[PDB]
Design a protein around this ligand. Structure first.
Ligand SMILES: *[C@@H]1O[C@H](CO)[C@@H](O)[C@H](O)[C@H]1NC(C)=O
Ligand SMILES: *[C@@H]1O[C@H](CO)[C@@H](O)[C@H](O)[C@H]1NC(C)=O
Ligand SMILES: *[C@@H]1O[C@H](CO)[C@@H](O)[C@H](O)[C@H]1NC(C)=O
Lengths: 189, 194, 127
């Protein structure tokens, strides 16, 4: 049994599975949170090719250990217990704004309602071989020492801090790519 | 007998280095020893090893949490004792492998170097200071403050058909580990085009 | 001991600087997903209570984590920043079970850094 867990923006927990042996069946998903001793069954199932393939739990911003089991009826096929935030995927940066000053730029965006996140800005000119990066605790990243005369491509994302959330989280998806030369927006680069 | 100390982390292993010396180098250090007590894992105290005019200890005993008393002793007599925390006297290691590549296409110079702290377990945030000036004659150095191991120098900022000298240093920037500027890296040189 | 008189921000600084790194060094080579997470905590005083227990109270299989560098630093941080912690100290004295237990510690320390996140431990409205 191969499993995937995603805690979308501290809102929804999605546990998905795949198991070729149990293809001719609907495996059932049973869960509970710490202390709440009796298991409850999934009330929101994901299906694939007509059979159960995942579960959606409304987690409502809660930081707990989710204890779960997938069963071939009564017989448990897979059992695990994980801190849900370890599988956190923050949402994509919203309301991204750029303010230029000579050879510098300050990128701001809407901060999330939860802490210990890194708001990362990546950028490059056609002369750069790879993306350069600057990140901060809040969505107010200032990148000094650029060239007003060059075109720069930019994009932002939110990461969870490994010291707080652990190593297996997902970065958010990157926000829309924007191009800038001489403090004005552009089409291509 | 006033003195200074600096620590350096994860030097030749998981081991840390503590270095102390007198402010007055014209001092007869005959029979004067440095002892550090407190904030150690398995022992109460350690005695530093003398090498010419400096004292040092390479050890894994430092807890890196809390203050230690560093004493200048003559026999069992304490001449002067200072309380300090190993985590607040960190001297960053100097960057290395400084390289400059002229990019005609970009009309600039790409400066790169290696930051040793990035390979360490603790202290993974340092501030860099890149300094450059023409290799011939006297000039006030131009300084660039960076948090990464690369920067560019636009062609227009430099004099044409000239040789430049460039060097870099680092300092801890961390909310826990505090300390001192590293020594400067060895200097590299480059030539500017027409 | 009551961990409500601790300087949490100072303890948090110590965790992020070195202790976190020492736990990672101890766990080196094990799959993150390899140990099931079983020990939970709520608020900072409760997390320090559970960290206290797992790091220093001797269990079966893992007799002693107390000599480990991460434990010695944890003892150091609590003696400095929790008043009356050293005045309550009891004055006498790698297994596949120790790695399990240290995995549990990593989770509690991480939860200690998320005190504002809500849990099943609810019902607290007021006037
Ligand atoms: C589904 O199984 C394939 C391998 O057969 C794997 O690539 C995929 O990631 C599994 N799905 C999940 C949810 O991990
Ligand atoms: C599996 O469940 C789906 C509905 O969720 C249903 O259409 C299908 O008949 C079930 N399969 C079995 C094996 O009963
Ligand atoms: C342990 O020893 C020290 C010194 O004897 C003392 O301050 C401490 O309170 C002792 N612990 C208890 C519980 O008495």
């Amino acid at each position: 049994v191969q499993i995937q867990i995603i805690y979308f923006n501290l809102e929804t927990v999605q546990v998905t599975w795949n198991a070729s042996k149990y293809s001719r069946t609907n495996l059932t998903f049973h869960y509970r949170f710490n202390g709440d001793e009796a298991y409850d069954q999934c009330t929101n199932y994901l299906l694939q090719e007509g059979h159960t393939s995942g579960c959606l739990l409304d987690a409502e911003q809660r930081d707990d250990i989710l204890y779960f089991s997938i069963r071939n009826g009564t017989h448990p096929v897979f059992t695990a217990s994980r801190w849900m935030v370890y599988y956190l995927k923050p949402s994509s940066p919203k309301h991204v704004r750029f303010s230029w000053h000579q050879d510098a730029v300050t990128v701001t965006c809407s901060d999330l309602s939860y802490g210990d996140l890194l708001y990362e800005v990546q950028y490059r000119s056609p002369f750069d071989t790879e993306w350069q990066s600057k990140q901060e605790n809040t969505c107010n990243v200032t990148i000094e020492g650029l060239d007003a005369e060059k075109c720069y491509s930019f994009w932002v994302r939110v990461k969870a801090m490994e010291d707080v959330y652990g190593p297996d989280t997902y970065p958010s998806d990157w926000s829309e790519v924007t191009c800038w030369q001489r403090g004005e927006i552009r089409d291509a680069c | 007998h006033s003195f200074w100390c600096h620590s350096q982390l994860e030097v030749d292993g998981s081991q840390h280095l503590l270095t102390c010396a007198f402010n007055d180098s014209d001092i007869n250090t005959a029979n004067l020893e440095f002892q550090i007590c407190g904030a150690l894992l398995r022992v109460k105290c350690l005695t530093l090893n003398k090498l010419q005019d400096i004292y040092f200890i390479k050890t894994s005993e430092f807890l890196l949490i809390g203050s230690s008393n560093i004493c200048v002793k003559l026999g069992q007599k304490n001449l002067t004792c200072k309380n300090m925390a190993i985590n607040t006297i960190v001297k960053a290691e100097a960057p290395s492998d400084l390289k400059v590549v002229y990019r005609k296409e970009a009309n600039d110079f790409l400066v790169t170097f290696n930051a040793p702290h990035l390979k360490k377990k603790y202290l993974k945030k340092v501030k860099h200071d890149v300094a450059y000036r023409p290799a011939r004659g006297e000039s006030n150095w131009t300084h660039v403050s960076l948090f990464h191991t690369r920067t560019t120098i636009p062609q227009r900022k430099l004099r044409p058909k000239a040789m430049y000298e460039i060097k870099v240093r680092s300092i801890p920037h961390n909310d826990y580990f505090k300390g001192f500027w590293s020594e400067w890296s060895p200097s590299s040189t480059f030539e500017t085009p027409e | 001991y009551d961990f409500t008189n601790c300087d949490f921000e100072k303890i948090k600084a110590a965790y992020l600087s070195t202790i976190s790194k020492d736990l990672i060094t101890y766990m080196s080579g094990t799959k993150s997903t390899e140990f099931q997470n079983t020990v939970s905590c709520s608020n900072r005083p409760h997390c320090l209570t559970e960290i206290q227990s797992l790091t220093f109270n001797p269990t079966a299989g893992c007799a002693s984590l107390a000599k480990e560098m991460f434990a010695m630093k944890t003892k150091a941080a609590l003696a400095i920043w929790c008043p009356g912690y050293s005045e309550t100290q009891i004055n006498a004295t790698t297994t596949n079970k120790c790695l399990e237990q240290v995995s549990q510690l990593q989770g509690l320390w991480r939860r200690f850094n998320r005190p504002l996140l809500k849990q099943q431990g609810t019902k607290h409205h007021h006037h």
